[PDB]
Protein backbone atom coordinates (compact mmCIF):
# COMPACT_ATOMS: atom_id res chain seq x y z
CA UNK A 1 0.00 0.00 0.00
CA UNK A 2 0.99 3.65 -0.45
CA UNK A 3 3.30 5.45 2.01
CA UNK A 4 2.04 8.61 3.73
CA UNK A 5 0.91 11.08 1.04
CA UNK A 6 2.11 14.69 0.85
CA UNK A 7 0.32 17.83 -0.25
CA UNK A 8 2.74 20.70 -0.83
CA UNK A 9 2.01 24.31 -1.75
CA UNK A 10 4.76 26.23 -3.51
CA UNK A 11 4.54 29.97 -2.88
CA UNK A 12 -3.39 37.47 0.66
CA UNK A 13 -1.01 35.19 2.57
CA UNK A 14 -2.69 35.92 5.91
CA UNK A 15 -6.18 34.84 4.84
CA UNK A 16 -4.78 31.63 3.39
CA UNK A 17 -3.00 30.80 6.62
CA UNK A 18 -6.27 31.54 8.50
CA UNK A 19 -8.08 29.09 6.24
CA UNK A 20 -5.51 26.31 6.67
CA UNK A 21 -5.45 26.78 10.46
CA UNK A 22 -9.23 26.27 10.61
CA UNK A 23 -9.18 23.21 8.35
CA UNK A 24 -9.71 19.77 9.91
CA UNK A 25 -7.81 17.03 8.13
CA UNK A 26 -8.98 13.58 9.17
CA UNK A 27 -6.74 11.25 7.18
CA UNK A 28 -2.96 10.86 7.37
CA UNK A 29 -1.12 13.31 5.10
CA UNK A 30 1.93 15.56 5.53
CA UNK A 31 1.14 19.12 4.46
CA UNK A 32 3.90 21.52 3.42
CA UNK A 33 3.91 25.25 2.79
CA UNK A 34 6.98 26.26 0.84
CA UNK A 35 7.71 29.93 1.19
CA UNK A 36 10.26 32.27 -0.29
CA UNK A 37 12.85 33.61 2.15
CA UNK A 38 11.14 37.00 2.54
CA UNK A 39 7.91 35.40 3.85
CA UNK A 40 9.36 32.56 5.91
CA UNK A 41 9.26 34.14 9.38
CA UNK A 42 5.68 35.38 9.03
CA UNK A 43 4.49 31.98 7.77
CA UNK A 44 6.03 30.14 10.73
CA UNK A 45 4.60 32.72 13.12
CA UNK A 46 1.08 32.37 11.71
CA UNK A 47 0.69 28.76 10.54
CA UNK A 48 -0.01 26.61 13.62
CA UNK A 49 -1.78 23.57 12.09
CA UNK A 50 0.31 20.61 13.32
CA UNK A 51 -0.14 18.59 10.10
CA UNK A 52 1.59 21.45 8.25
CA UNK A 53 5.32 22.04 8.08
CA UNK A 54 7.12 25.03 6.62
CA UNK A 55 9.60 24.59 3.81
CA UNK A 56 12.35 26.87 2.55
CA UNK A 57 13.24 27.07 -1.13
CA UNK A 58 16.48 27.02 -3.08
CA UNK A 59 18.95 27.63 -0.23
CA UNK A 60 22.38 26.45 -1.34
CA UNK A 61 24.73 28.09 1.13
CA UNK A 62 26.11 26.10 4.09
CA UNK A 63 25.49 28.95 6.56
CA UNK A 64 22.04 29.56 5.10
CA UNK A 65 20.98 25.97 5.70
CA UNK A 66 22.45 26.12 9.21
CA UNK A 67 20.49 29.29 9.99
CA UNK A 68 17.23 27.82 8.62
CA UNK A 69 17.61 24.74 10.88
CA UNK A 70 18.35 27.03 13.84
CA UNK A 71 15.11 28.88 13.09
CA UNK A 72 13.05 25.68 13.08
CA UNK A 73 12.86 25.04 9.32
CA UNK A 74 13.36 21.34 8.55
CA UNK A 75 12.00 21.01 4.97
CA UNK A 76 13.18 22.50 1.68
CA UNK A 77 12.21 22.47 -2.00
CA UNK A 78 15.03 22.21 -4.54
CA UNK A 79 15.35 22.02 -8.31
CA UNK A 80 11.95 23.51 -9.17
CA UNK A 81 11.40 24.14 -12.90
CA UNK A 82 12.44 27.81 -13.17
CA UNK A 83 15.67 27.12 -11.23
CA UNK A 84 16.76 25.03 -14.16
CA UNK A 85 15.27 26.82 -17.17
CA UNK A 86 15.79 30.44 -16.05
CA UNK A 87 18.37 30.60 -13.22
CA UNK A 88 20.68 28.06 -14.78
CA UNK A 89 20.94 25.41 -12.05
CA UNK A 90 22.23 22.24 -13.77
CA UNK A 91 21.40 18.64 -12.81
CA UNK A 92 24.61 18.60 -10.78
CA UNK A 93 24.00 21.95 -9.05
CA UNK A 94 20.55 20.72 -7.99
CA UNK A 95 22.05 17.40 -6.88
CA UNK A 96 24.73 19.17 -4.80
CA UNK A 97 22.05 21.35 -3.21
CA UNK A 98 20.05 18.22 -2.32
CA UNK A 99 23.02 16.40 -0.75
CA UNK A 100 23.95 19.49 1.30
CA UNK A 101 20.38 19.94 2.59
CA UNK A 102 20.17 16.26 3.58
CA UNK A 103 23.54 16.46 5.38
CA UNK A 104 22.19 19.45 7.34
CA UNK A 105 19.21 17.39 8.51
CA UNK A 106 16.58 18.56 6.01
CA UNK A 107 13.68 16.65 4.47
CA UNK A 108 13.98 17.43 0.77
CA UNK A 109 11.41 17.75 -2.00
CA UNK A 110 13.51 17.42 -5.16
CA UNK A 111 11.81 18.46 -8.39
CA UNK A 112 12.44 16.91 -11.80
CA UNK A 113 10.54 17.12 -15.08
CA UNK A 114 10.76 17.43 -18.87
CA UNK A 115 10.14 20.31 -21.27
CA UNK A 116 7.45 20.52 -23.95
CA UNK A 117 9.93 19.62 -26.73
CA UNK A 118 11.38 16.72 -24.74
CA UNK A 119 7.86 15.36 -24.22
CA UNK A 120 6.86 15.80 -27.89
CA UNK A 121 10.02 14.08 -29.18
CA UNK A 122 9.41 11.17 -26.82
CA UNK A 123 12.45 11.90 -24.65
CA UNK A 124 10.62 12.25 -21.31
CA UNK A 125 12.18 9.07 -19.89
CA UNK A 126 15.81 9.79 -20.70
CA UNK A 127 15.50 13.37 -19.44
CA UNK A 128 13.78 12.75 -16.09
CA UNK A 129 15.99 9.74 -15.33
CA UNK A 130 19.16 11.67 -16.14
CA UNK A 131 17.95 14.32 -13.70
CA UNK A 132 17.25 11.83 -10.87
CA UNK A 133 20.45 9.85 -11.52
CA UNK A 134 22.39 13.07 -10.91
CA UNK A 135 20.58 13.49 -7.59
CA UNK A 136 21.14 9.84 -6.60
CA UNK A 137 24.86 10.04 -7.39
CA UNK A 138 25.40 12.37 -4.43
CA UNK A 139 23.35 10.35 -1.93
CA UNK A 140 23.83 7.13 0.00
CA UNK A 141 21.02 4.62 0.40
CA UNK A 142 20.01 5.82 3.88
CA UNK A 143 19.58 9.37 2.58
CA UNK A 144 16.38 8.47 0.72
CA UNK A 145 14.38 8.41 3.96
CA UNK A 146 14.85 12.20 3.84
CA UNK A 147 13.98 12.60 0.16
CA UNK A 148 10.72 13.19 -1.68
CA UNK A 149 10.49 13.38 -5.48
CA UNK A 150 8.28 15.92 -7.23
CA UNK A 151 7.59 15.12 -10.87
CA UNK A 152 6.44 18.22 -12.75
CA UNK A 153 6.17 18.40 -16.55
CA UNK A 154 7.50 21.88 -17.35
CA UNK A 155 4.70 22.39 -19.88
CA UNK A 156 2.11 21.80 -17.09
CA UNK A 157 3.42 24.37 -14.61
CA UNK A 158 1.19 27.46 -14.46
CA UNK A 159 -0.10 26.87 -17.99
CA UNK A 160 -3.46 25.31 -17.16
CA UNK A 161 -2.47 22.18 -19.03
CA UNK A 162 -2.57 19.28 -16.55
CA UNK A 163 -1.07 15.88 -17.29
CA UNK A 164 -3.70 13.19 -17.84
CA UNK A 165 -3.89 10.43 -15.22
CA UNK A 166 -2.23 8.12 -17.78
CA UNK A 167 0.63 10.56 -18.35
CA UNK A 168 1.28 11.13 -14.65
CA UNK A 169 1.05 7.43 -13.80
CA UNK A 170 3.43 6.46 -16.57
CA UNK A 171 6.03 9.03 -15.46
CA UNK A 172 5.73 8.17 -11.78
CA UNK A 173 6.03 4.46 -12.53
CA UNK A 174 9.18 4.81 -14.62
CA UNK A 175 10.72 6.91 -11.86
CA UNK A 176 9.83 4.35 -9.20
CA UNK A 177 11.07 1.50 -11.39
CA UNK A 178 14.44 3.21 -11.81
CA UNK A 179 14.69 3.80 -8.06
CA UNK A 180 13.79 0.16 -7.46
CA UNK A 181 16.53 -1.04 -9.84
CA UNK A 182 19.31 1.37 -8.95
CA UNK A 183 18.70 1.99 -5.24
CA UNK A 184 16.62 -0.89 -3.86
CA UNK A 185 13.00 -2.06 -3.96
CA UNK A 186 12.78 -1.22 -0.27
CA UNK A 187 13.58 2.44 -0.94
CA UNK A 188 11.28 2.39 -3.97
CA UNK A 189 8.26 1.21 -1.98
CA UNK A 190 8.58 3.94 0.65
CA UNK A 191 9.41 6.82 -1.72
CA UNK A 192 6.86 9.62 -2.11
CA UNK A 193 6.58 10.69 -5.75
CA UNK A 194 4.36 13.76 -6.03
CA UNK A 195 2.72 15.16 -9.14
CA UNK A 196 2.70 18.88 -9.93
CA UNK A 197 1.55 21.11 -12.77
CA UNK A 198 -1.98 22.55 -13.06
CA UNK A 199 -3.34 20.42 -10.24
CA UNK A 200 -6.66 21.80 -9.04
CA UNK A 201 -9.75 20.99 -7.00
CA UNK A 202 -11.44 19.24 -9.91
CA UNK A 203 -8.60 17.03 -11.17
CA UNK A 204 -6.55 16.11 -8.06
CA UNK A 205 -8.80 13.30 -6.79
CA UNK A 206 -8.59 11.36 -10.06
CA UNK A 207 -4.81 11.75 -10.21
CA UNK A 208 -4.34 10.35 -6.69
CA UNK A 209 -6.20 7.17 -7.61
CA UNK A 210 -3.22 6.28 -9.84
CA UNK A 211 -0.98 3.53 -8.46
CA UNK A 212 2.23 5.56 -8.25
CA UNK A 213 0.93 9.01 -7.26
CA UNK A 214 1.69 9.91 -3.60
CA UNK A 215 0.44 13.48 -3.55
CA UNK A 216 0.86 16.87 -5.15
CA UNK A 217 2.84 20.06 -5.45
CA UNK A 218 0.61 23.05 -6.28
CA UNK A 219 0.33 26.81 -5.80
CA UNK A 220 -0.55 28.45 -2.50
CA UNK A 221 -4.23 29.10 -3.22
CA UNK A 222 -7.63 28.63 -1.53
CA UNK A 223 -8.23 25.44 -3.52
CA UNK A 224 -5.20 23.85 -1.87
CA UNK A 225 -7.68 22.74 0.79
CA UNK A 226 -9.40 20.54 -1.81
CA UNK A 227 -6.08 19.18 -3.07
CA UNK A 228 -5.29 18.10 0.50
CA UNK A 229 -8.70 16.43 0.68
CA UNK A 230 -8.01 14.66 -2.62
CA UNK A 231 -5.08 12.73 -1.09
CA UNK A 232 -7.26 9.67 -0.40
User: In terms of Cα–Cα distance, which of 94, 105, 103, 182 is closest to 134?
Assistant: 94
Name, in order, each residue with C-beta under 8 angstroms of 196's C-beta and a sequence gap of 6 or more: 10, 111, 113, 150, 151, 152, 156, 157, 216, 217, 218
Q: Which of 89, 114, 118, 152 is catalytic?
A: 152
> Is 39 tagged catalytic?
no
Residues 146-185 that bind ligand X1R (CB under 6 A): 152, 157-158
- Report if residue 110 touches ligand X1R, rule: CB under 6 A: no
Q: Which is nearer to ligand X1R, 157 or 183 (CB)?
A: 157
Residue 201 in the binding site for ligand X1R (CB under 6 A): no
Stretch that binds ligand X1R, among 113-121, 138-146, 177-185, 214-222 (CB under 6 A): 214-222
CA–CA dist 232, 223 (Å, integer): 16
Name which position in 43, 198, 214, 231 contacts ligand X1R (CB under 6 A). 198
Which x/- pattern over 34-63 shows residues binding ligand X1R (rule: CB under 6 A)?
Answer: ------------------------------
Question: How would DSSP label each residue in 115-158?
Answer: -HHHHHTT-HHHHHHHHHHHHHHT--GGGGGGEEEEE--GGGSS
DSSP state at residue 39: G
Question: Is 203 annotated as ligand-binding?
Answer: no
Task: Let me know if 80 is a catalytic residue.
Answer: yes
How many other C-beta atoms lie within 10 A of the C-beta of residue 15? Answer: 9
Catalytic residues: 80, 152
By the criterion CB under 6 A, which residues form the site for ligand X1R?
10, 152, 157-158, 196-199, 217-219
Binding positions for substrate are: 10
Amino acid sequence: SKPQPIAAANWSLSELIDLFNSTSINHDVQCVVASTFVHLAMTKERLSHPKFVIAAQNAGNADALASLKDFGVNWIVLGHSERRWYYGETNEIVADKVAAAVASGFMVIACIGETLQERESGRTAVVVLTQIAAIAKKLKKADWAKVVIAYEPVWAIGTGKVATPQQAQEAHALIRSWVSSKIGADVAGELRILYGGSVNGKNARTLYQQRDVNGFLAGLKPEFVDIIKATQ
